[PDB]
Amino acid sequence: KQYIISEELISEGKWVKLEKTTYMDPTGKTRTWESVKRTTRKQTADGVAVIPVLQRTLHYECIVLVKQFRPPMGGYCIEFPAGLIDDGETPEAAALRELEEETGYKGDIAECSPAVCMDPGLSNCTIHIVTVTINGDDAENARPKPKPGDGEFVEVISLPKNDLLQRLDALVAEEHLTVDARVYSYALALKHAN
Amino acid sequence: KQYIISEELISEGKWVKLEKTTYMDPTGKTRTWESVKRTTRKEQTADGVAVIPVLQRTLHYECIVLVKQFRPPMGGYCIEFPAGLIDDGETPEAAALRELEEETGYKGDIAECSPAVCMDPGLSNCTIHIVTVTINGDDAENARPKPKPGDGEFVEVISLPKNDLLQRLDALVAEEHLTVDARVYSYALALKHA
Ligand SMILES: CC(=O)Nc1cc(C)[nH]n1
Ligand SMILES: [Cl-]
Ligand SMILES: [Mg+2]
Ligand SMILES: [Mg+2]
Ligand SMILES: [Mg+2]
Ligand SMILES: [Mg+2]
DSSP states (O other), X not given: OOEEEEEEEEEEOSSEEEEEEEXXXXXXXXXXXXXXXXXXXXXXXXEEEXXXXXXXXXXXXXXXXXXXXXXXXXXXXXXXXXXXXXXXXOHHXXXXXHHHHHHOOOOEEEEEOOXXXXXXXTBOOEEEEEEEEEETXXXXXXXXXXOOOTTOOOEEEEEEGGGHHHHHHHHHHHHOOEEBHHHHHHHHHHXXXX | OOEEEEEEEEEEOSSEEEEEEEEEOTTSOEEEEEEEEESOOSSOSSSEEEEEXXXXXXXXXXXXXXXXXXXGGGTEEEEEOXXXXXXXXXXXXXXXXXXXXXXXOOOEEEEXXXXXXXXXXXXXXXXXXXXXXEEETTSGGGSSOOOOOOTTOOOEEEEEEGGGHHHHHHHHHHHSSOEEEHHHHHHHHHHHHO
């Protein structure tokens, strides 16, 4: 019933553009929407985000997260490791690469979502969520080496999967950080499960 | 270490603006970022709310109430948590219960309310509160609930069993062209991983 008629460019930067989308509402009335798009997509999705499950024997299972300054936010955020998929990269490969660059961990793919939307009222941005396990007892993960690209400055924060939501709340209460909505949603469902 | 130096308007629509953000990197070098913001945020603790609505009914498994709508940024239909922007002066909890009623017909009870969490912090400053709400589906109020759509709202309600959420989402994505929201997928994944 609903569909796009046309798109009018409003403004195009190097990384982000703003468009005015004309669409047909389900009554047959024509309406407009201000929409954001990245300029970098070519790919299954813009990006990947990695759910990294750090597994060490005789330890709690941890979810590995990253803390970074985020200029749109004006502050530090706590997020799953993540980045944009390179032209001709698979989402799995992007996930393992981003995980290694941001955390130093070498992981294995457990599963891969279809393309999921980030904020569909505002943008067309999509990611694959890639669940990855990390064998924390393997030698290659003993002293994990994070490899920043130019202009990346990433702190690693591993938190126990069994108390994830409480630990995140505590970081926000003490550290004045913003938690990512996907991280918080995952944490919630860990608590809400059965 | 890192902080904002300046924020220069590039393009302002009615609903969304683009900005050139100048910030200090942790090496002491000046860098820039293209940042998206909404024009609608006044004194709210966040732009919006998304509601995690747990429908509870005697001799039923618990369901997660979701909504399906056309999203002009995406050019297609998306499956999301019920959500909307917080009106000026409105609390997040009030916004959540209100949006849940408008979008689904259900009258919920507040369970918990997150701190402001970031939607896509590498792109935008947008934040929400994630509000958990229980719905007593045994109450007469919630017997045959009718969405009260606002002007330009056209929302379908989809209730899926919590105990099978990820597979049920996969089966909906396998049957037509639609995108599942990243927060919904994240929450469904943690339900599986728990
Ligand atoms: C250096 C770089 O990637 N800047 C970006 C990304 C976005 C979304 N805005 N600006
Ligand atoms: Cl796992
Ligand atoms: Mg990244
Ligand atoms: Mg990276
Ligand atoms: Mg809505
Ligand atoms: Mg609404």
